[PDB]
């Protein structure tokens, strides 16, 4: 059974923990408890093979980013469609990963989280799609940790990218 080191990155409050806990444990985290560093393990089936995911749920700010990026095989870059600042911050993370990895060929997915908060949307779906295209046709999903939309697909897509 192949091991996959996945890293969930993004600014404070975007729902990195919520997405990870929903995927791994099938629970929605209501309380906002700022993460220091949490690691989760989950066996999944992707393309007819059993995969052991090690998911690193990171802090919204710094510490061990360069280390996470050196060790990590795949990266979920999460913003909240509710908070423009969290979308703006992801450019720096994208560039940092490519720098540390020293290649543009890095398994990565852009995730617009909290898509259940349609009314409170500050960042448009098209603006998300626009950013992903700019990132060398990067994978893109709008997700909800609460509604359980495209939660599993975030982690499945990274495993598929690592396998190529």
């Amino acid at each position: 059974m192949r091991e996959y080191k996945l890293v969930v990155l993004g600014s404070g409050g975007v729902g990195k923990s919520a997405l990870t806990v929903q995927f791994v444990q099938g629970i929605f985290v209501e309380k906002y408890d700022p993460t220091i560093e949490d690691s989760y393990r989950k066996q999944v089936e992707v393309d007819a093979q059993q995969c052991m995911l090690e998911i690193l749920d990171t802090a919204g700010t710094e510490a061990m980013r360069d280390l996470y990026m050196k060790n990590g095989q795949g990266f979920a870059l999460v913003y909240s469609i509710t908070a423009q600042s969290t979308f703006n911050d992801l450019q720096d993370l994208r560039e940092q990963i490519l720098r540390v990895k020293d290649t543009d060929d890095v398994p990565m997915i852009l995730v617009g989280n909290k898509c259940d908060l349609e009314d409170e949307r500050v960042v448009g779906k098209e603006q998300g799609q626009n950013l992903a295209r700019q990132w060398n046709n990067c994978a893109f999903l709008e997700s909800s940790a609460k509604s359980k939309i495209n939660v599993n697909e975030i982690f499945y897509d990274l495993v598929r990218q690592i396998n190529r």
């Binding site: 444990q25 099938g26 993460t35 949490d38 690691s39």
Partner: protein
Amino acid sequence: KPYEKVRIYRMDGSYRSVELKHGNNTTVQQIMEGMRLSQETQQYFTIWICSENLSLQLKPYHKPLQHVRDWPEILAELTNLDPQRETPQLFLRRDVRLPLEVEKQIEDPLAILILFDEARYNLLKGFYTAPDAKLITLASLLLQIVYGNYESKKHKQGFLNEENLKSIVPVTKLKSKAPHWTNRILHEYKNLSTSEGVSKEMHHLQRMFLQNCWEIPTYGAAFFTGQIFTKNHKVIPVYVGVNIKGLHLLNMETKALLISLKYGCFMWQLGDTDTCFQIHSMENKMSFIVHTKQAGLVVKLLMKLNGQLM
């Protein structure tokens, strides 16, 4: 920014980093508050300190990082191991004092998944002795939980190889007995998936697994290491299991259940120097002595868990 932190592990190898607000003087109580647990989730669990050959449940007042610091001295006091192989880690695990009656109360999905993960760890390590039937039921529930719904096309033939069997049967049964169970496991697996009366909610399937574990004699046991001498005088390394049900001896090598005694059916006596304890099986003409530098801890826990029954 210059704050100290510690990783609290679970049996699956996952961890949560917790800020140490008082450095190495931070208590179990303060660390437990630092976890992402409600009081509904928290009351069933506590911090353990564990290396490969010694596991201790810590109390709310204990300072876990000082136990990490003093681990070589603790090993020297409680064991005959060499400290080179043992750097300890901190774990969130079931409180050994948790009554089975209270655990049967639990509806909280997070509490259930933590108890489930720990139960599965003990099953796969071979610390649960149960008939082939019980083990096959547990194996079927792990297939539903881990692999999802049975599909003839995926699971019928050439699926339950040793790789897949390793994750659903005890390591003690994997090579010899498990291969003959494969058809009976898959049958119960199919029966689960195609039964619309059996909830496929994760916490429901996990509670079903636990339900089957609650009837196992050693369930929720704290394990200690010792030796017994046979009556010519062959040394047998043993695990001493103490839980809310009673005392259990496993052969250390094979994990075979040598004896299981319920509270009210046996008495204990602590040796003069906490290096051994004697068990007398009330109305069973049977007596044995376990040699262990953990003898003091074993009797202390027997007294607490026996005393807990009212």
